[PDB]
Ligand binder design. Structure first.
Ligand SMILES: Cc1ccc(-n2[nH]c(C(C)(C)C)c/c2=N\C(=O)Nc2cc(COc3cccnc3)n[nH]2)cc1
Length: 259
């Protein structure tokens, strides 16, 4: 990837290390590719430069259909990490914009796609820590991709977190399972924020006493049941993502049959 082939267009957001720009990359074939170009302040420590660059070193290895894609890296100053840009943007806002036209089958599809990504992470004992619809991008109506690009960060959102994460800052694959079911609640609620009726400080109290997020109107009952299993207080009683894939695939086929 040569710098002359990357054209920057507008600020996408601020990341931890520097601004992130929307851009266009023209590849060796000559096609134009929408990219998110991540930058790093020049005055950062060697450690922070290493951390910044480590994203590209890691992500080069990820090629899952439901994980975001690293396009490339320009190592020379100014050092740029070039991620694929998904013009549809975040799933939460996508759902908000499209509530009147989306079918439940499609909501279950997205849940299963993310579950498959997470089962892959579980297979290598990696944890996400920030599973939420803001970290999922829509590649197309038929395809979502999981990212990890929130300003906290290879491995707080209180209203998404397991009780052990809230109480002890403990984060395991089992706590990701809890967070993933919250993400599913967001999907099935067309982007509503979980516990929007509470302040962060009230959340643990509610969980300790046995209260949970109510079933979204459109959520199939069997899917709500799975959600509630992911919200078992005891991390040992939550399913593994690997087995959840099987459970979700069953819900998808039940939903596809009735459609
Ligand atoms: C050091 C380090 C840092 C991050 C990671 N991980 N880990 C993961 C897992 C595999 C999911 C866990 C993803 C990841 N990186 C990213 O998601 N990067 C990314 C995405 C974006 C936003 O892109 C957009 C936004 C809007 C529209 N279009 C595109 N910015 N940066 C790994 C190592």
């Amino acid at each position: 990837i040569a710098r002359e082939d990357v054209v920057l267009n507008r600020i996408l957001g601020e990341g931890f290390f520097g601004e992130v720009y929307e851009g266009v990359y023209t590849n060796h074939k000559g096609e134009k590719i929408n990219v998110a170009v991540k930058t790093c302040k020049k005055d950062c420590t060697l450690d922070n430069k290493e951390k910044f660059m480590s994203e590209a070193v890691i992500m080069k290895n990820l090629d899952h259909p439901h994980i975001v894609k690293l396009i490339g890296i320009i190592e020379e100053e100014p050092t740029w990490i070039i991620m694929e840009l998904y013009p549809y943007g975040e799933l939460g806002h996508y759902l908000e914009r499209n509530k009147n036209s989306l079918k439940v089958l499609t909501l279950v599809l997205y849940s299963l796609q993310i579950c498959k990504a997470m089962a892959y992470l579980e297979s290598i004992n990696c944890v996400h820590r920030d599973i939420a619809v803001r970290n999922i991008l829509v590649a197309s109506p038929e395809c979502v991709k999981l990212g990890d690009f929130g300003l906290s960060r290879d491995e707080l959102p209180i209203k998404w977190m397991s009780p052990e994460s809230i109480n002890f800052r403990r984060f395991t694959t089992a706590s990701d399972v809890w967070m993933f079911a919250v993400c599913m609640w967001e999907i099935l609620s067309f982007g509503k924020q979980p516990f929007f009726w509470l302040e962060n400080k009230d959340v643990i109290g509610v969980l300790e006493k046995g209260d949970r997020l109510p079933k979204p109107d459109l959520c199939p009952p069997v899917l709500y049941t799975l959600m509630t299993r992911c919200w078992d207080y005891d991390p040992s009683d939550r399913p593994r993502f690997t087995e959840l894939v099987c459970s979700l695939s069953d819900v998808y086929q039940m939903e596809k049959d009735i459609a």
